[PDB]
């Protein structure tokens, strides 16, 4: 659903603002790596996390 790239903002829930850095995956599943509390590798689509 939620489809993320470099360079996206978001902001989630817990850790506020990131910036997206890395994206793996496809769908429900995909990952990303979120620089915020630091780099966070999560699965977005399973996150309390908005597109900015």
Aim: glycine content about 12%; cysteine-free.
């Amino acid at each position: 659903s939620m489809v993320l790239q470099p360079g996206d903002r978001v902001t989630h829930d817990k850790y506020g603002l990131g910036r997206v850095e890395e994206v793996a995956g496809t769908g429900e599943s995909a990952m990303s790596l979120i620089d915020f509390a630091g780099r966070v590798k999560l699965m977005h689509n399973h996150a309390p996390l908005q597109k900015l």
